[PDB]
Paper text:
In view of the KasQ–UDP-Glc complex, the UDP portion is well defined as it is surrounded by an array of highly conserved residues, His209, Leu267, Ser286, Gly287, and Gly289. These residues may act as a set of the interlinking acids/bases triggering the elimination/addition reaction for the epimerization of UDP-GlcNAc to UDP-ManNAc. The C3 hydroxyl group of the hexose moiety is also within hydrogen-bonding distances to both the guanidino group of Arg309 (2.7 Å/2.9 Å) and the carboxyl group of Glu119 (3.3 Å). The C4 hydroxyl group is interacting with both Lys17 and Gln95 through hydrogen bonding (3.5 Å and 3.1 Å, respectively). The C6 hydroxyl group is likewise interacting with the carboxyl and amino groups of Asp97 through hydrogen bonding (2.5 Å and 2.8 Å, respectively). Importantly, the carboxyl group of Asp97 that is located on top of the sugar plane relative to the C2 atom (3.8 Å) likely serves as the general base to deprotonate C2 in the first half of the reaction, yielding AAG and UDP; the Arg309/Glu291 dyad, on the other hand, acts as the general acid, likely protonating AAG to afford UDP-ManNAc, thus completing the epimerization reaction. Q95 was found interacting with the C4-OH of UDP-Glc in contrast to the histidine (H) counterpart in homologous 2-epimerases, which is at a distance from C4-OH of 4.5 Å. Despite the fact that KasQ exists as dimers in solution as well as asymmetric units, only one UDP-Glc molecule is bound to one protomer of the dimer.
Our biochemical and biophysical analysis determined that KasQ converts UDP-GlcNAc to UDP-ManNAc as the initial step in the biosynthetic pathway. To better understand the catalytic mechanism of KasQ, we solved crystal structures of KasQ for the wild type (WT) and its complexes with UDP or UDP-Glc in resolutions of 2.44 Å, 2.58 Å, and 2.09 Å, respectively. In brief, each monomer consists of two domains (N-terminal and C-terminal domains), in which each subdomain is made of a typical sandwich (αβα) architecture of a Rossmann fold.
Residue numbers in the entry:
A (entry chain G): -1 to 39, 44 to 63, 67 to 185, 190 to 346, 351 to 374
B (entry chain C): -1 to 38, 45 to 63, 67 to 183, 192 to 374
C (entry chain D): -1 to 39, 45 to 64, 66 to 183, 192 to 374
D (entry chain H): -1 to 39, 44 to 63, 67 to 374
């Protein structure tokens, strides 16, 4: 019956759910807080695995203006009905931005989980890069995964007292599933060098993804003992490009999206990871897996500077060369093996929330 | 199978539900009547065993809300074959529902009729709501002789006014672990504060008075169940959340709230209902307003106005904790302000006399 | 360019328009004020007095009271805010007057009530007009009472004396402003003017009144009646089916206000259930027989200007006979010199009350 | 038939229309550009005076979330239908924010007129202070009125090449009406002010409604009682609550002329005749010093710190004793008066801001390497 700080948790996507799950679990266990989940949008599967129970699903997530209009227009009512005291948004989504704005309209304070990631390339990608900069102005409190991300927030006028370097909750999430099976994946990878590849970014759809698929095909032809596992993003155009280039190759296992527990176990077994995923750039180095990044830019410069990760873009010759170097030269491999925190990020977020909103002078 | 007088019961809020619950229970138990509940709260419904036949999901601009109730309440009143409609208190629901009932020529009774400050449109719209309901209602259940006098001054005929007392006393009587652990062996002040006209700075001054009293009196405790509004929660939380002597609470179930009030040494409130409940438990009340609709407790010395002046609140709480003669002067037995706890039965007999009789 | 008090004027019916017209004209002429008309429902009355509505809400019509009141409460706020209304005036006893007063109160726009304090003392009779007056009375900051009796009714409902002004009735102002087939029909004959519209008298009671007209016509070959019919098909049908063959009765369409007042001036007496005609007819020295069991104009009853006759055909025949046959009974129902309902300066008295309340500082 | 850069101009209010009008006129006159006006929201009167012709009026206007939702949802269609290339928004309005976002959603680049004004008080006022910081992240180009405002933009991570110190277009707007004596005349205002010391007062901010405005009105009443020769002209913001507070405190005082909103030409002429100006208006803080009129600011904070630092303006809040004292000092002591008009500093620009905006637009969007 003691007053709990009621913390709104608003997300629409898998990566948001994975990164918020450890914060939800910490808020649930602590008697000083009550998490209240509102979804805007694979997700049931993540909710089941971590035991997340949404109070409300807005069935909103299509033109960007129409989607943002609906969230700005409609999120206020459930936030008020659920007596939310403070709202947490995560990452770079149009949900995170529109929900932060909707919360601000009701004078509900906002906290941003995973604050301060920047490429320095204006509107690239769109709208994610501008979403971060808008959320940054709306948020009272910022949970930065790294010192570099905290620096980016100060350069946009955020006061140092509003910034906590908590590390990234994705490390917490990884640790939760590492201390907890898939027959077909085990049978396919057992006793083989397996490359794990994920690729989903809209700016790479069609021809650039086709080049990456051609690089995979070439590596498979040249290296009969090499295997690839490619869990496919749930978009029909992404599935069609990989399927049409690779479905006949016995050395490639094209997969449905994997449950996070199975995905992390697979990543642990992989010899290296090719990805355009932000989260996988954080997860893979933590498991000592070299990462080749299928983009021209990254929001994770820490991995680049430490030699954990290299940019490879969608150039098939460079991908073939760089994967070859790592498989053939054990010194190049070892040169690519904490950037993103220790796995206590949820507890550091909780203590920042308690200090800001459960304290009086 | 004998004809029952079907009594519409319309409310949208906790205070209405608490005050109507004893009337609903009396109507349910009496074979001459059938209560029909329409809402415009689940926890209060569960506690008293109230089962709404219809929930209109209406409760935003005042004009839009009143428009919806006037427009939409008629259909469920007609569908449920309501004979007579009861509304309670001062809400825009009570006013708009009384009007919607009048439009269908359904006679209206007003529970807790005739409370006045004498300050026009203060608060708005509650003060005007009472005066509009007063003209719409055929029958008025006044809690006190003073309230009956206010009805006569607005042209209500004496035969349409019954001094029933307040059903909140009935409600208290019906309901009579972390809270126990926090209060056991300590002087505990119970504080509630919710009025829109006190939001922000005035509530901040009251919270500062609490902080000062806590610093000066290490043995003093406060329990503050917070009104479910984020701005109210924010002011108390930001002023008091670090003070070990203050337990900030979620809204309490009515049974738990009344038990806490019984254990408290005194009550600070801007609540109308708590001004009626606290004196009935012999707890001195300091009223966190510049006006009250409960002048009876003021006149009898049960209650004193303190407003949102932190110096006056500190002084007045100090007087009661330090001077046992000042304390006893606010509990003197013998004078009954708000009724005996038989208000539901007196309402039922007024309903039977008016609408279950023939000349 | 000096600030004007912007006065909302809200009405939906002929009687409201007639009684508000002199106040609108006074507000228009005075530089301290700007009238803003919003209608809920009349072109003919607007043309005659030069009233120009800024907004017509197309709300009124066969419609439920709750649906109409819901629409006015819901929708009148927007034009009141858009037109920057400072204060709102409503008139009389209509559901428009009540719902508009409430809509204005919701936007914290102060309300004034023109023709405040009329009471029968019969609860919900008629419905909803009697309750509308008592609701408007609680909502209004300022009350323009036509008579001392009406002011007394307001004090008995808890209104402070400082909020009540005895202005008289603006219908006298309206009459004074307006002061061929009808001429051809009435020339050389004693003509009774009859109007009857009240919903509580529809069907059988109106049929009894029509039978009384028929009986008077049969017994008095020289007597004529002119009956302008309220625009309701049921009212038209009852009079038409009882009287359309009688050469002594002219059933009429509603008359323009100027023509109606001229006809009333020519009439020997008036039979009506109209509130306004009970005020207009005595001012022209015409005895009034009131086709109701109650009146909100007790002043005319007490002064002998008017008598209640209800819908009893024997009583109507008797009372009309007495007035036509006995010039002493006729003269007893005329009081030239003395005024029941005001002097025809009610608009100016309203304006000065508005200036005192809302265009003054301590 | 040569391609013009089609520049969307979106506003809903008088202050926006006044500050955008000189940019619209410069875009209209230059053959390289075509202004396209879309309104969201007194305004006809400003449109007539400057010859602004809106292509679309949205009639949106109420809860902030509902209004912002409607602009984000519905402004895209007219922007696309009118083939807008670039969008300009002005100031701190929820229209400016929601329109900038709606433009960004259609990949229409945004320029912000009057960029970089800051109090340093988070969410004060709400939502204007956050609107500026959101527009700042959305806009590709920023027209800062002062070097101080440009400094505030760089501290929020704006690249120097995206910030131009143009000055404030309100000075351009003033200059456009100063040249028009015939249109600036008003019989009743002339009769009231001719041969008298006249104080001009405007006050509209929501955070001052009710009690604070009442204190300001009491200060006016006290100054009037103490100084029988003093006059006040108070054009009232079109809000019934604002009108009621001034009317109920001042309507009987022959020394106070309460007015309907004045046409901008007449308002600037009145300000030129006034001995001093009391205001919570942003624009009047910029206009008054340009006419050499000391300004007392009826707020606890300002986004025009330049006028405070240069001694052109002083914060007076809504404290009636301080207002009476400060107005008294300026009327009674010609040295105190002259200290608030000292020459040697131009705070808000020279009245060439529209031309500097145009040249920034051409360099950014009408150039190839
Ligand atoms: O079959 C799969 C594939 C991936 N993952 C997990 O999914 C996450 C990443 O999902 P993805 O859709 O690839 O999104 P990201 O690109 O990682 O995330 C973007 O969106 C996030 C939310 O806005 C931001 O935090 C990031 O910075 C941004 O890169 C990682 O934790 C993976 O382990 C699975 O569980 N199963
Ligand atoms: O944590 C809490 C706090 C209060 N209460 C009860 O809630 C009621 C008071 O509710 P509150 O929201 O404070 O409203 P009031 O101020 O009491 O009531 C207003 O509204 C009522 C309905 O219109 C009117 O009868 C009153 O005169 C008017 O003051 C009382 O019965 C309390 O015992 C609880 O059960 N739990
Ligand atoms: O052909 C006709 C008949 C009547 N009238 C005039 O119409 C008005 C009366 O209209 P009516 O429809 O009879 O309404 P009333 O019964 O007079 O008015 C009711 O409605 C008004 C507004 O609510 C209240 O002021 C009254 O007290 C109430 O009785 C009077 O001024 C008449 O002179 C005409 O102009 N032409
Ligand atoms: O009767 C009058 C009174 C004022 N004005 C003019 O109106 C403008 C002021 O408008 P106002 O409504 O007082 O708004 P401001 O407070 O000046 O403007 C706010 O809103 C603008 C748009 O977001 C921002 O540029 C400003 O920083 C912000 O302070 C000025 O140019 C005045 O000269 C008139 O034309 N007539
Ligand atoms: Na918890
Ligand atoms: Na029963
Ligand atoms: Na006028
Ligand atoms: Na041009």
């Amino acid at each position: 019956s003691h007053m709990a700080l009621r913390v709104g948790i608003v997300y629409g996507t898998r990566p948001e759910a994975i990164k918020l799950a450890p914060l939800v679990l910490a808020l649930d266990a602590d008697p000083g807080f009550e998490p209240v989940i509102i979804t805007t949008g694979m997700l049931d599967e993540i909710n089941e695995l971590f035991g997340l129970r949404p109070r409300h699903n807005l069935d909103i997530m299509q033109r960007l203006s129409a989607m943002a209009s609906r969230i700005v227009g409609e999120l206020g009512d459930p936030l008020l009905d659920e007596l939310v005291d403070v709202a947490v948004v995560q990452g770079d989504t149009s949900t995170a931005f529109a929900a932060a704005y909707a919360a601000a309209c009701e004078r509900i304070p906002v906290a941003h989980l995973e604050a301060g990631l920047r490429t320095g390339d204006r509107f690239e990608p769109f709208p994610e890069e501008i979403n971060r900069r808008l959320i940054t102005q709306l948020a009272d409190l910022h949970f930065a995964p790294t010192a570099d991300a905290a620096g980016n927030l100060l350069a946009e006028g955020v006061r140092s007292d509003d910034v906590y370097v908590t590390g990234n909750t994705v490390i917490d999430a990884m640790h939760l599933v590492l201390d907890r099976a898939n027959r077909e994946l085990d049978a396919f990878t057992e006793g083989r060098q397996t490359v794990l590849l994920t690729m989903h970014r809209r700016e790479s759809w069609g021809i650039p993804m086709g080049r990456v698929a051609a690089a995979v095909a070439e590596l498979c032809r040249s290296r009969p003992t090499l295997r690839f596992v490619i869990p496919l993003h749930p978009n029909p155009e992404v599935r069609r490009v990989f399927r049409s280039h690779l479905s006949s190759l016995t050395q490639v296992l094209l997969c449905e999206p994997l449950r996070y527990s199975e995905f992390i176990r697979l990543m642990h077994r992989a010899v290296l990871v090719l990805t355009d995923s932000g989260g996988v750039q954080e997860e893979a180095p933590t498991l000592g897996k070299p990462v080749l990044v299928l983009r021209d830019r990254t929001e994770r410069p820490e991995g680049i500077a430490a030699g954990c990760a290299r940019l490879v873009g969608t150039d098939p010759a460079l991908i073939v060369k760089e994967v070859g170097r790592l498989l053939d030269d054990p010194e190049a491999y070892e040169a690519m093996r904490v950037c993103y925190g220790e796995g206590d990020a949820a507890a550091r977020c909780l203590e920042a929330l308690r200090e800001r909103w459960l304290s009086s002078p």
